[PDB]
Design an enzyme around this catalytic site. Structure first.
Site, PDB file in Angstrom:
ATOM      1  N   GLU B  12       0.852  -1.182   0.000  1.00 43.15           N
ATOM      2  CA  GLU B  12       0.000   0.000   0.000  1.00 43.15           C
ATOM      3  C   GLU B  12       0.890   1.234   0.000  1.00 43.15           C
ATOM      4  O   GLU B  12       1.749   1.385   0.875  1.00 43.15           O
ATOM      5  CB  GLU B  12      -0.939   0.022   1.207  1.00 43.15           C
ATOM      6  CG  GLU B  12      -1.961   1.152   1.146  1.00 43.15           C
ATOM      7  CD  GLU B  12      -2.562   1.483   2.495  1.00 43.15           C
ATOM      8  OE1 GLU B  12      -2.188   0.831   3.492  1.00 43.15           O
ATOM      9  OE2 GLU B  12      -3.407   2.403   2.555  1.00 43.15           O
ATOM     10  N   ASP B 127       8.191   9.123 -13.085  1.00 41.84           N
ATOM     11  CA  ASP B 127       8.468   8.472 -11.805  1.00 41.84           C
ATOM     12  C   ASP B 127       9.234   7.175 -12.023  1.00 41.84           C
ATOM     13  O   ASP B 127       8.889   6.136 -11.450  1.00 41.84           O
ATOM     14  CB  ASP B 127       7.172   8.203 -11.033  1.00 41.84           C
ATOM     15  CG  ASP B 127       7.394   8.099  -9.525  1.00 41.84           C
ATOM     16  OD1 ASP B 127       8.453   8.547  -9.032  1.00 41.84           O
ATOM     17  OD2 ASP B 127       6.505   7.566  -8.828  1.00 41.84           O
TER      18      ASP B 127
END
Ligand SMILES: CC1(NC(=O)O[C@@H]2CC[C@H](c3cc(NC(=O)Cc4ccc(S(C)(=O)=O)cc4)n[nH]3)C2)CC1
Lengths: 274, 298
Positions: B12, B127
């Protein structure tokens, strides 16, 4: 043909073919309102004109409006039978999806419900945005009418040093051509012609067929049908004159041309029908 | 969402909640990103709408595929293709023995192919870090996590500032450039390239100014000659210390002269001169891995 110069980051032909190939992925039907017999073509103009004014109030980009226009027209082509009171929800939710995609700091959900004068709640917009995106198969990355004009303007003012990614073109003449496109998009019959054809045809009315062909790559025979259709809309703009480049507080002047504006219009769309 | 059975939570983070699921009838395993819509006040997050739409038009063997988007019960499930390991965990496991040079060349070649596909489709990743590079048991490596990605126009306009994780952030971003495009991904890949060679981050900075000084300490403090306009950038200071460029024989010792040449061109200060993904594929560093196609000179 391909008007892009030699690109250092990819094949100039490959980038152009990819932009052309996705235009076949995104379908448009100039008669999708026949699937909704209760609606009339004028209602679409009133809604799109309202979304333009909403964009100027919150200083949204022109790309954001044309994304909402494309999401609206393509979602309607998948649906059948829609009432007038449902048009405002579909329009504001298409703009909500578009604003979240394009803007860096988009407006919040309740502000999109706020401009509807209470006719649309926040939960209604969230329900509508999911139905729109699911019906469009999540195909939410089209080449808008205004995006083609940005390409055509950069190529028109390409220096001998070919650098196509850094913007450089007069903002004054860009917003004048956008003014003609903002009028033509209110008429539903524009979907007959591809978005790249509409932008090139508007550029032609402010320049020439030689300049159009050098920056769009399309022959005169490709846009002649669109130019002849854009004939009434072009003169209504010429009769009233060209608009001035506005300044928006909080927006840098180098990005002032990309902000969506709104004129009354509507009556101008009726003069073109004559 | 019946045929899928969760096996283990992958993690997560900013991406969301990712589970490893397994199809009970077919035996397929997938990576399942869970999005709780009841928590999101603004509906579907902008990063999710962007990533879904971009990935549905970026089908490439070196890009992690988006298989399906399922809206079931106030939740949005994103079904991705499954890869068993990220590059960062593979480099750490290989830190003592070192990644074999043929495998480094193969991984970089595939990364440049997936990146050249993204850029030809006018998509910036923004990214590229080892955590976002996934590998399978068949020698492939793939780009993942397009939540921070953005499609750029031709020409581009001013996009979101301070993108890319700090260690892999290009110097033009750290100096506050107005516009940017494909060069920021090549810089990140150059950092990842050197990191695979040295088994250690090339510029492991802790702040924006420390990241910039670490770049200056290795590549030299840039000036107007090596980078026209650097002295006019918003975050440029004349008080920046003057460091000399280090010999790449010390920066990447194991790298041969073909590798040092490619790495230098990927780490060029000037974003206009920095080598492109497509041009990097034609570099003599891969002349043994690929053969050029005949070019129609018409
Ligand atoms: C997770 C992250 N962000 C991201 O947005 O990626 C997207 C969304 C889901 C997709 C995916 C991920 C994966 N695989 C992995 O990430 C690596 C992995 C596998 C298994 C286990 S284990 C022993 O079961 O706990 C741990 C770790 N395949 N497809 C691509 C960094 C990449």
């Amino acid at each position: 043909g391909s008007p892009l110069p030699v690109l250092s980051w990819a094949n100039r032909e490959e980038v152009w073919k990819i932009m052309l190939n996705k235009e076949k992925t995104y379908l448009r039907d100039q008669h999708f309102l026949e699937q909704h017999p209760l609606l009339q073509p004028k209602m679409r103009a009133i809604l799109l004109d309202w979304l333009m004014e909403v964009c100027e109030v919150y200083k949204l980009h022109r790309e954001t409006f044309y994304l909402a226009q494309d999401f609206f027209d393509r979602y309607m082509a998948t649906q059948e039978n829609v009432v007038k009171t449902l048009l405002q929800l579909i329009g504001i939710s298409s703009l909500f999806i578009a604003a979240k995609l394009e803007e860096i700091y988009p407006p919040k959900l309740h502000q999109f419900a706020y401009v509807t004068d209470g006719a649309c709640s926040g939960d209604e917009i969230l329900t509508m945005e999911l139905m729109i995106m699911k019906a469009l198969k999540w195909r939410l990355s089209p080449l808008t009418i205004v995006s083609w004009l940005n390409v055509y303007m950069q190529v028109a003012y390409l220096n001998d040093l070919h650098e196509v990614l850094l913007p450089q073109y007069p903002q004054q003449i860009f917003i004048q051509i956008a003014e003609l496109l903002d009028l033509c998009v209110l008429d539903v019959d524009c979907l007959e012609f591809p978005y790249g054809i509409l932008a090139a045809s508007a550029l032609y009315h402010f320049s020439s067929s030689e300049l159009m062909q050098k920056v769009s790559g399309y022959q005169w025979c490709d846009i002649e049908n669109c130019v002849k259709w854009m004939v009434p809309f072009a003169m209504v703009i010429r009769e009233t004159g060209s608009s001035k480049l506005k300044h928006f507080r909080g927006v840098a002047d180098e990005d002032a041309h990309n902000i969506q504006t709104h004129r009354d219009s509507l009556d101008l769309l009726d003069k073109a029908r004559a | 969402m019946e045929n899928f059975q969760k096996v283990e939570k992958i993690g997560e983070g900013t991406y969301g909640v990712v589970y490893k699921a397994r199809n009970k009838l077919t035996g397929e395993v997938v990576a399942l990103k869970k999005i709780r819509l009841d928590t999101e006040t603004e509906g579907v997050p902008s990063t999710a709408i962007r990533e879904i739409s971009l990935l549905k038009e970026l089908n490439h063997p070196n890009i992690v595929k988006l298989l399906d988007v399922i809206h079931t019960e106030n939740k949005l499930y994103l079904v991705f293709e499954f890869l068993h390991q990220d590059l960062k965990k593979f480099m750490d496991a290989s830190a003592l023995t070192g990644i074999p040079l043929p495998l480094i060349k193969s991984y970089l070649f595939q990364l440049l192919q997936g990146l050249a596909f993204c850029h030809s489709h006018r998509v910036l990743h923004r990214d590229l870090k080892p955590q976002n590079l996934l590998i399978n048991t068949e020698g492939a490596i793939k780009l993942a996590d397009f939540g921070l990605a953005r499609a750029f126009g031709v020409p581009v306009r001013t996009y979101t500032h301070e993108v890319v994780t700090l260690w892999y952030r290009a110097p033009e971003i750290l100096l506050g450039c107005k516009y940017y495009s494909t060069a920021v991904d090549i810089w990140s890949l150059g950092c990842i390239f050197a990191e695979m060679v040295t088994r250690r981050a090339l510029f492991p900075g802790d702040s924006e100014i420390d990241q910039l000084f670490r770049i200056f300490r290795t590549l030299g403090t840039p000036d107007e000659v090596v980078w026209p306009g650097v002295t006019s950038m918003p975050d440029y200071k004349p008080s920046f210390p003057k460091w000399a460029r280090q010999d790449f024989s010390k920066v990447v010792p194991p790298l041969d002269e073909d590798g040092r040449s490619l790495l230098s061109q990927m780490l060029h200060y000037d974003p206009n001169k920095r080598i492109s993904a497509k041009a990097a594929l034609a570099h003599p560093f891969f002349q043994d891995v690929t053969k050029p196609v005949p070019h129609l000179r018409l």
